[PDB]
Design a protein around this ligand. Structure first.
Ligand code: HEO
Ligand code: HEM
Ligand SMILES: [Cu+2]
Lengths: 501, 257, 185
């Protein structure tokens, strides 16, 4: 019931679950290697659709979602200088709710009648699933319970920050991982509700026979698409804004130099938070968008680079004067500054209307984002996990394998997704189960090969940690890292006295 | 085994596929320099290359350093957007010479039926057409929505139930082709592939209809219509020697009232 | 001596959840409208949306003439309850017509519902017909709470909070009619 421990509380869920998601994906990604039915032994799409779709359904709402709701949960307090968090009992349920959705997910899976409508689950496919259709139902329920949860966190923490930092600290002395935490946090507020409404709208459709989206009586699809996608873009921002914070400190500490372009970055975080509720149509282009409405939603997103450059370039200058260390933590930090900016172009490219007409929903798409997610977000989680692993466990991280798991993680990404880009130009249809053109059948092999490595690595790390808790070099210092790492939390004991601090 | 945009056999594709490469070559001005600054660091700014870690705050022309240039990209690689953002777009755009055929897509369950307004036949999983000519596309849906797309032609668009999708196309070389579905996945969403037989001239095109005209089957009614749209994945390239005067409208209507 | 009025701004932000909900929703309706009134259309006479409004309108000032004689102005214990009571009464009433109408809109319609204009609308209020259920039940519950516990000047957090939640509700209702009913029709 203490924010700090709840913090871990999250990570656990995530980890225990990636042991599931990965497994899930690690497995299906095979089918595209060999031809015909393969060793899979699956009858028509029934399952393929479910699985590969359930995947992304998870990774976004249950294993990578915890990241922000987990991290800010264990580190925002101890560094602003507080004693816990504004709404006690509530900060607890903010998680316990995200938990419900959990067991609730394997409820649609525990009967094999789990949906297959896209991690979002579009119309004409959702409601039409016969009266006995309890399939999507479970899906529409798990995200509701889970919905409300994360809805509070952004509220809760918002208050904590706007009324409980350290005495004397002006909002300007606010640490990087905190500034960003605000931004993304407010987002969960002015944006997450959107979905709830939408999710409800469906509710009646399939449960009460209403026609919020049935064009055979009065409803329309061009409505449901707007909402999910209106609030969707933000989802991709709250899941990376915070990382900016975690990234900043892991960088600054070890390089031994303050985060350059302070003010600059400041507003960036701000700016980036504004230009988000007006650019969602870049998920619409094909579904018939007004040549002029194309720009109002295509051009807007095109400027959003300028804000991205700020951050990057600003961290660079933080390196330019030397004396950087490259341990576990600083190592991920590297990847970020690399991979992230890699897939970036892909977004700057698809930004233009036509530039995507041929790539939309094509493998290119899959290659565009997994980039910015895996090598841009999933790196964060790990990257941070190091920097703070002691501050919450009482022990530091094995620098040995940490440098090991890393490579397998950087390497494999590319041998598993750069190939997908190709498949896109030749125009490959997403989530297909059956293809034939020998060409695709090739890159797929590389891709399905890039993973064999990534897969094994998810094991090395996870096995290393075990080895790090049980077996440990019990650190009894206050700050295992150089004087560079300067944030009120550090000065504290690791772990903290049970009643915080 | 390919790593570049589709075969250049269409006018549009140029001012739509060139787009990507063109800009990608005018974007690199950044990533390369980004894949430059990030790299060079762990180099000289290291411990055995820099006695210590001096410290400073700003200059404000540090932003400028990487300020005016990014936005310079998002301008060059911006002006283009606007202009380039047209051609394939719907609305109405007139351009005729009493020759451009007007197909009507009726993508049903895991198959691709077609309606020829001034011909009298019907198709499934294959639509032929002359070369260097306008291909008028009328699209919608009978079941769930879908995507009308020809890779080597960079021609994609949705097909929502109860609505008409507008798109036109120009082929500039013979040969057959293939068309894929939409982002949706399910039993057969990965089998809905059709061709784009682009013969040498229309002389042999007039015969494509001919052969079908012979087909011992016709699409004269809605009762028969729901029959060809009945549950059946991967439908063989079938035909029809007759199509009710207003089948297109026959669909929308039923799914609008 | 600061954490006192914390759940306030810590709730005032909470409205940003039930404040946007009522906006995207309106957007749906605002869509599910221009579909042109095709045949079957249920009209509303300007009487209920005046008695419904008035009722719910007196509450806008069933707390305006109250807040003071609740604590702000020198509290008077009971003088902060009988009024809540009246207030609860209007809530139970406002919800009444909100039910008489529906019934009437399903007494003729022997079950099967049709069109979206009797859909979105059919729901737009529902929400506004639920918000004023719990936000009408939490009120009366705290009522029995203010009894034994009994709050007093400065020390009144919730009743000055709720006097912001609800005060927002009516605001959302100073449109509903002033957009849906009159304008729509
Ligand atoms: C959280 C992950 C994440 C992130 C960070 C991004 C970031 C961006 N995304 Fe991607 N996206 C992500 C996740 C997704 N995007 C999607 C879809 C998507 C689509 C629609 C494609 C489609 O669905 O068919 C577009 C056009 C973009 C654009 C962008 C842009 C411009 C950025 C920008 O943020 C990029 C910022 C980085 C830049 C700009 C490069 C770095 C270099 C700079 C900044 C220097 C300046 C450069 C210039 C001036 C040229 N995204 C989808 C698919 C949804 C679905 O399944 O349907 C997902 C999941
Ligand atoms: C390197 C580990 C991962 C592998 C190997 C992997 C693999 C895949 C594959 C093969 C697909 C299906 C593509 C298709 O056929 O269309 C997919 C889809 C998807 N993945 Fe991943 N993925 C990984 C990590 C992630 C992560 C970290 C996220 C982020 C939350 C993610 C989100 C998604 C989403 C949203 C989809 C689409 C789901 C849908 O079809 O509805 N993936 N992934
Ligand atoms: Cu987006």
């Amino acid at each position: 019931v203490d924010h700090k421990r709840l913090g871990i509380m999250y990570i656990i869920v995530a980890i225990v679950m990636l042991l599931r998601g990965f497994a899930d994906a690690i497995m299906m990604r095979s089918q595209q290697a060999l031809a015909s039915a393969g060793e899979a032994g699956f009858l028509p799409p029934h399952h393929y659709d479910q699985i590969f779709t359930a995947h992304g359904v998870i990774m976004i709402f249950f294993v990578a979602m915890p990241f922000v709701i987990g991290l800010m949960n264990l580190v925002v307090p101890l560094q602003i200088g507080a004693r816990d968090v504004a709404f006690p009992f509530l900060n607890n349920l903010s998680f316990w709710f995200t938990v419900v959705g959990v067991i609730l997910v394997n409820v649609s899976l525990g009967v094999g009648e789990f949906a297959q409508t896209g991690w979002l689950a579009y119309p004409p496919l959702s409601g039409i699933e016969y009266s006995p259709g309890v399939g999507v139902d479970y899906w529409i329920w798990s995200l509701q319970l889970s919905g409300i949860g994360t809805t509070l966190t952004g509220i809760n923490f918002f208050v904590t920050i706007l009324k409980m930092r350290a005495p004397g600290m002006t909002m300007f002395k606010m640490p990087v991982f905190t500034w960003a935490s605000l931004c993304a946090n407010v987002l969960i507020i002015a944006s997450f509700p959107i979905l709830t409404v939408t999710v409800a709208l469906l509710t009646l459709d399939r449960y009460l026979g209403t026609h919020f989206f049935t064009n055979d009586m009065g409803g329309n699809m061009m409505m449901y698409i707007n909402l999910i996608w209106a609030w969707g873009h933000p989802e991709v921002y709250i899941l990376i804004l915070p990382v900016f914070g975690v990234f900043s400190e892991i960088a600054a500490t070890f390089s031994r130099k303050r985060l350059f372009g302070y003010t600059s970055l400041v507003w960036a975080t701000v700016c980036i938070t504004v230009l988000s509720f007006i650019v969602w149509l870049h998920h619409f282009f094909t579904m018939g968008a007004g040549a002029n409405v194309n720009a109002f939603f295509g051009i807007t997103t095109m400027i959003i680079a300028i804000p991205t450059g700020v951050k990057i370039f600003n961290w660079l200058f933080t390196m330019y004067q030397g004396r950087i260390v490259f341990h576990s933590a600083m190592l991920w930090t590297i990847g970020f500054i690399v991979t992230f900016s890699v897939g970036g172009m892909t977004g700057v490219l698809l930004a233009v209307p036509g530039a995507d007409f041929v790539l939309h929903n094509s493998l290119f798409l899959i290659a565009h984002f997994h980039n910015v997610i895996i090598g841009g977000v999933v790196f964060g989680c790990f990257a941070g996990m190091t920097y703070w692993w002691p501050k919450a466990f009482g022990f530091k991280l094995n620098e040995t394998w940490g440098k090991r798991a890393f490579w397998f993680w950087i390497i494999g990404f590319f041998v598993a997704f750069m190939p997908l880009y190709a498949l896109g130009f030749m125009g490959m249809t997403r989530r297909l189960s059956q293809q034939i053109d020998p060409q695709f059948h090739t890159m797929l092999m590389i891709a399905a090969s890039g993973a064999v490595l990534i897969a094994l690595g998810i094991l090395c790390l996870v096995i290393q940690m075990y080895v790090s808790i049980r077996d440990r070099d019990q650190n009894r210092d206050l700050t295992g890292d150089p004087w560079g790492g300067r944030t009120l939390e550090w000065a504290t004991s690791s772990p903290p006295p049970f009643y915080n601090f | 085994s390919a790593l570049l945009d589709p075969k250049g056999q269409i006018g549009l594709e140029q001012r739509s596929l060139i787009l990507t490469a063109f800009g990608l070559m005018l974007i690199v001005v950044i990533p390369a320099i980004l894949m430059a600054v990030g790299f060079a660091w762990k180099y000289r700014a290291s411990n055995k290359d820099a006695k210590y870690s001096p410290n400073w705050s700003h200059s404000n022309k540090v932003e400028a350093v990487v300020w005016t240039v990014p936005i310079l990209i998002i301008i060059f690689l911006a002006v283009l957007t606007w202009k380039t953002t047209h051609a394939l777009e719907p609305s109405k755009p007139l351009a005729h010479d009493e020759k451009p055929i007007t197909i009507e897509v009726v993508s049903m369950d895991w198959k691709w039926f077609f309606i020829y307004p001034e011909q009298g036949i019907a198709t499934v999983n294959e639509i032929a057409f002359p070369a260097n000519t306008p291909v008028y596309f009328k699209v919608t849906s009978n079941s769930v929505m879908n995507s009308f797309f020809i890779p080597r032609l960079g021609s994609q668009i949705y097909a929502m139930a109860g609505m008409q999708t507008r798109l036109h196309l120009i082929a500039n070389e013979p040969g057959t082709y293939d068309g894929i579905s939409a982002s949706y996945s399910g039993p057969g969403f990965s089998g809905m592939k059709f061709k784009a037989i682009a013969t040498p001239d229309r002389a042999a095109f007039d015969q494509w209809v001919a052969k079908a005209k012979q087909s011992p089957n016709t699409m004269s009614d809605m009762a028969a219509f729901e029959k060809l749209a009945a549950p059946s994945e991967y439908n063989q390239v079938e035909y029809f020697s007759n199509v009710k005067p207003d089948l297109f409208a026959d669909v929308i209507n039923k799914f609008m009232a | 001596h600061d954490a006192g009025g914390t759940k306030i701004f810590g709730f005032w932000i909470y409205l940003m959840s039930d404040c946007i909900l009522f906006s995207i929703l309106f957007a749906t309706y605002a869509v599910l409208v221009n579909g042109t009134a095709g045949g079957p259309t249920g009209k509303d006479i300007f009487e209920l949306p005046f008695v419904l409004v008035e009722t719910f309108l007196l509450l806008f000032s069933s707390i305006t003439y109250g807040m003071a004689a609740i604590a702000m102005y020198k509290n008077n214990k009971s003088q902060v309850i009988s009024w809540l009571a009246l207030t609860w009464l209007f809530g139970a009433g406002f919800i009444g017509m909100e039910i008489y109408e529906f019934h009437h809109l399903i007494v003729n319609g022997m079950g099967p519902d049709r069109s979206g204009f009797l859909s979105a609308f059919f729901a737009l209020v529902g929400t506004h017909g639920l918000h004023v259920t719990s936000g009408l039940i939490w009120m009366a519950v705290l009522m029995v709470q203010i009894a034994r516990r009994g709050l007093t000047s400065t020390n009144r957090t919730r009743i000055m909070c709720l006097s912001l939640f609800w005060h927002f509700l009516d605001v959302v209702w100073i449109c509903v009619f002033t957009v849906v009913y009159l304008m729509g029709a």
